[PDB]
Amino acid sequence: GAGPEMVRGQVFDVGPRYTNLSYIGEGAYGMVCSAYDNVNKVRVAIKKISPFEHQTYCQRTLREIKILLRFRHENIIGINDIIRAPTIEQMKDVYIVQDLMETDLYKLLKTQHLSNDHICYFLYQILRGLKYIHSANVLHRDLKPSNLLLNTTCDLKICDFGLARVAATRWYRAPEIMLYTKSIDIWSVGCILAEMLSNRPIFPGKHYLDQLNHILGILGSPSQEDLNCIINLKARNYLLSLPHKNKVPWNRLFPNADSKALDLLDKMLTFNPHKRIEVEQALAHPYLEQYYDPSDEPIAEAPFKFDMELDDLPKEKLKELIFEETARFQPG
Numbered sequence: 001g002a003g004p005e006m007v008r009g010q011v012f013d014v015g016p017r018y019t020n021l022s023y024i025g026e027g028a029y030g031m032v033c034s035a036y037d038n039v040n041k042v043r044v045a046i047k048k049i050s051p052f053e054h055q056t057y058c059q060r061t062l063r064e065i066k067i068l069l070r071f072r073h074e075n076i077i078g079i080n081d082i083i084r085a086p087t088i089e090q091m092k093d094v095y096i097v098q099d100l101m102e103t104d105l106y107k108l109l110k111t112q113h114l115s116n117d118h119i120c121y122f123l124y125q126i127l128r129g130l131k132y133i134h135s136a137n138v139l140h141r142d143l144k145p146s147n148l149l150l151n152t153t154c155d156l157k158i159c160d161f162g163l164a165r166v167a168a169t170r171w172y173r174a175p176e177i178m179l180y181t182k183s184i185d186i187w188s189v190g191c192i193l194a195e196m197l198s199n200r201p202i203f204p205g206k207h208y209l210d211q212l213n214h215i216l217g218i219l220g221s222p223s224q225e226d227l228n229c230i231i232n233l234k235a236r237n238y239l240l241s242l243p244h245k246n247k248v249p250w251n252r253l254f255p256n257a258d259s260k261a262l263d264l265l266d267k268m269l270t271f272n273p274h275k276r277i278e279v280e281q282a283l284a285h286p287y288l289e290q291y292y293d294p295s296d297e298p299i300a301e302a303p304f305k306f307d308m309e310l311d312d313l314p315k316e317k318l319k320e321l322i323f324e325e326t327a328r329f330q331p332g
């Protein structure tokens, strides 16, 4: 008996099945480690989640588990296993086990220059994965390079469905969020495409006002139609108080980019969410012609829906629902 496993002064109780732990990353209420699975004889990714002190954290944990266990797609991360305590009174943490990928798009863009063919293939896989998510009437709401996992052969998977809802990181947030619909994910994909083209975030604001200023600095001052929606009074009056800003052509920001990539980028980074390109039209765009294949782009059989009103349930009821949902991965 070795006792419970530990990583950087905190318990990571995944043994005896998962051993030889190595720290990967950390979040506000969760740590990610790689581990050796002695059953499948392969290294896996394990996320420790400690959400029971807050109702919102419990909601996100339950939403992610239910969505990922239901979803089955090549470009979406699956859940292989879930570890938690034998009794609800002892359950203070939840460990989700997933495939261990090589890296993420955040790390790849920090150290590698991407060829147009690699940008095209990654964009294709993101939209193919998004086509499946959106067909299930689910919004990811937090697409960004760190949520895009890559294997050695350049295959891509979308992860982190904690903020997903039935129909976030500031730099990839759609202007209407700051001013939610399926179109908010297309914006985020637009921001990721622009980042793949230059290895730099296109709208790197320090705060929400600086974010809007970064967006207007490239798209130009918004029109009357762009602003007239169910917009926040302060945000509207602020945008109206700003001096005129000229639109910066895409070929001026990305002078060495493929003209087809910039035409698609234009349609994804449209201020008005109603005029923004939808996932099926984006896949069919001439930029993705080499990879577009509607015969091999699966969709969800039916739209996703939660049986209960998760927002209204007390954290103690959500703790019970998490215990019940994770019971199928327990022995017996």
Ligand SMILES: Fc1cccc(-c2cnoc2-c2c[nH]c3ncc(-c4ccncc4)cc23)c1F
Pocket: 024, 032, 045, 046, 047, 077, 096, 097, 098, 099, 100, 101, 102, 103, 104, 107, 149, 159, 160
């Ligand atoms: F729910 C889970 C369960 C296990 C891990 C995660 C998670 C959260 N953020 O990335 C991951 C990863 C899942 N599989 C992975 N494989 C590799 C990497 C990784 C990232 C950066 N450098 C190297 C490896 C991350 C993950 C997760 F969301």
